[PDB]
Design a protein around this nucleic acid. Structure first.
Lengths: 129, 88, 218
RNA sequence: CGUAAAGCGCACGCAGGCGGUUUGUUAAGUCAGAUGUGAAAUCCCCGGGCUCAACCUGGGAACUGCAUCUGAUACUGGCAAGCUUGAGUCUCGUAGAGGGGGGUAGAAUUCCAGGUGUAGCGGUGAAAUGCGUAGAGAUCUGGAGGAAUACCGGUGGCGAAGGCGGCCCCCUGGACGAAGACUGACGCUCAGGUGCGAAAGCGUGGGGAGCAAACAGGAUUAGAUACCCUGGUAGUCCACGCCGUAAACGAUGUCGACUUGGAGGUUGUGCCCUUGAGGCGUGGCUUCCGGAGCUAACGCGUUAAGUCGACCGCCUGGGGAGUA
């Protein structure tokens, strides 16, 4: 019952696109906002608001290139039931290198590409094709 | 059903104060009060299976609270069990 | 820009959520449409027509309900266009390769009727062709002169006429539908929210289209 | 893993697995670098030598690993301190065939005791067995008992599931709602284990109206070890134990989050007018129709078989066999 809110974030985004909602709100947390920045800086989302005092309401404005969803695929990997860690030079490319693999590093969260140029691995969170 | 009056005596006897009705300490007494109470109704009738499932729950309820309270502050744990007669 | 009184929004409780962007709650459990976002619609789509009309394109006006079919009849026969007011013959467009043959039959008979053969066998069967002429009449009457494929489908109702919309959509052709609260706008290209079945509604509609199409050959 | 093989009958629950959120802290797992080592051969890479090749052979890479040392501290873990949106407690109420125990009411059936009265009654496709002139059936009055609760009654309600139905009383479980107060992650799942678990069946003692396996007679029938009829024992009912199986079935494990709608039913509750059987909202359970999507298709469809996460059970061609 609500084991991994990280997967919850993704799902609420995946389901958000299906309904073509403008923005999907969720109970923010430090970790989630970290991921949100990666996506926005990448271009899968627009302008997350982190409203909240003790009830963090992170609402994510969604992007639509056309009447088609921008996020073409979002699947989580290191789940609570199973974590996954990969060596620096062993990261896997997403969509032949035109997607992203949001990876948590000793230097925080970043894109899989950011990790290589920074030369460090870590816990791969998820894929966004 | 642990008459309103019964609770009004129990809460004053265990919690941090009279307005307290949520604290782990108090909650345990309430269950035990009920558990002890059903003994007669269950040592007798010996058949109300539907009712017993009701009882059996609060037994489970109680234990979980204690286990929580034991790992948190053995101090309050040791006193409550001593002040409430349990731990077979 | 409320030109005339009642066009605001109607038809039901059992609406269609697909048009949730265009609604207002009414005091009958009936919906009321936000024509405010519609004012830009019919203004804009008319420009589309004007451009294509000058391209010497064709505009096809379909009406139904038996009520406003007459109104539409006047619309196409007012500038130069074609119309379909009776039962939209399933597949005239996607299967035009054969419906073309039906058209030829009418033209010949049209000659055979006003000046042609009318007594060669017996009045009883001479009557047969006449009533047959009536059959092709209400079907391919206001379309006989087209002889090809149109380039714009102006449709009054999207409920009764989803049949053609899908067909038109299946072809490389744009459509213009006066969709209603219980209509699917996803089959349309340049949506027009508002009423469809109201009698006076089309009168406002078509004439507005009639003028735009009248000048649109500039 | 709805219908093809595959959700334990349902549930509680130890070990086990996983775990909300804030901050600090430590640096175990994780990451970076270096180091020691990881036998040679073999494989791979670039060369070389036998007329080429097979083959021999130089240098490198690799040996996917492990141990140590030093940095990194995001994520998971250990510790400490909180927070409240998860969970739980209290107060005031609500609906209900929820469970066990004790009484009780009326209709009806059967039997017994009389009154009235007379040749059929009953049964079926027809008929026969059978009941009856010792006087039935029918009808009236009185009594005896056993079991089940017409109407209300409703893809209505309650319960984990099996299930649960006249009325009254006692003991008692759970669910849900308004409004806040309070505790402060105390959770979800769960092998082994324990409990509950239809009908039938079993044991000991009661009860025995109706119904009815077995059994008998009479028909039907080519036969009829049946289907039909007349009777009828165990059983069905109560008490205490055992059995542990059902097509125990929405053939759909439990819990949680997110994702257009419509008509209904039922039970709470705030508000506008109760101004007139109402209108405006928010919650709990449940019925049907269908969007996206999903699917082998049928269909499911905010109570999902849609999109995901936690944990557990289970399947691996049919028959042999759920048997030895």
């Amino acid at each position: 019952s609500m084991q991994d809110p990280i997967a919850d974030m993704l799902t609420r985004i995946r389901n958000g696109q299906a309904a073509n909602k403008a923005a999907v709100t969720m109970p923010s947390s430090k970790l989630k906002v970290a991921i949100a920045n990666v996506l926005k800086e990448e271009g899968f989302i627009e302008d997350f608001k982190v409203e909240g005092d003790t009830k963090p309401e992170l609402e994510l404005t969604l992007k639509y290139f056309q009447g088609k969803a921008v996020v073409e695929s979002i699947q989580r990997v290191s789940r609570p039931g199973l974590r996954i860690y990969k060596r620096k030079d062993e990261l896997p490319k997403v969509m032949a290198g035109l997607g992203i693999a949001v990876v948590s590093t000793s230097k925080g969260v970043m894109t899989d590409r950011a990790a290589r140029q920074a030369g460090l691995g870590g816990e791969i969170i998820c894929y966004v094709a | 059903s642990l008459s309103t009056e019964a609770t009004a005596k129990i809460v004053s006897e265990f919690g941090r104060d009279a307005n307290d009705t949520g604290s782990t300490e108090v909650q345990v007494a309430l269950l035990t009060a009920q558990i002890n109470h059903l003994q007669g109704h269950f040592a007798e009738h010996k058949k109300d299976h539907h009712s017993r499932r009701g009882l059996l729950r609060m037994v489970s309820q109680r234990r979980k609270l204690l286990d929580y309270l034991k790992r948190k502050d053995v101090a309050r744990y040791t006193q409550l069990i001593e002040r409430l007669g349990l731990r077979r | 820009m409320l030109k005339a009184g009642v066009h605001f929004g109607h038809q039901t409780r059992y609406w269609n959520p697909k048009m949730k962007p265009f609604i207002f709650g009414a005091r009958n459990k009936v919906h009321i449409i936000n024509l405010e976002k519609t004012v830009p619609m019919f203004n804009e789509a008319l420009a589309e027509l004007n451009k294509i009309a000058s391209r010497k394109g064709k505009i096809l006006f379909v009406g139904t309900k038996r009520a406003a079919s007459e109104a539409v009849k006047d619309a196409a026969l007012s500038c130069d266009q074609f119309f379909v007011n009776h039962r939209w013959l399933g597949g005239m467009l996607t299967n035009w390769k054969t419906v073309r043959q039906s058209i030829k039959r009418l033209k010949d008979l049209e000659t055979q009727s006003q000046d042609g053969t009318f007594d060669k066998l017996t009045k009883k069967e001479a009557l047969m062709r006449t009533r047959e002429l009536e059959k092709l009449e209400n079907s391919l009457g206001g379309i006989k002169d087209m002889g090809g494929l149109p380039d714009a489908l102006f449709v009054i109702d999207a409920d009764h006429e989803h049949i053609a919309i899908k067909e038109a959509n299946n072809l490389g052709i744009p459509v213009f539908a006066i969709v209603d609260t219980n209509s699917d706008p996803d089959g349309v290209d340049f949506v027009i929210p508002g009423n469809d079945d109201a009698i006076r509604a089309v009168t406002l509609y078509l004439g507005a289209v009639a003028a735009t199409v009248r000048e649109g050959r500039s």
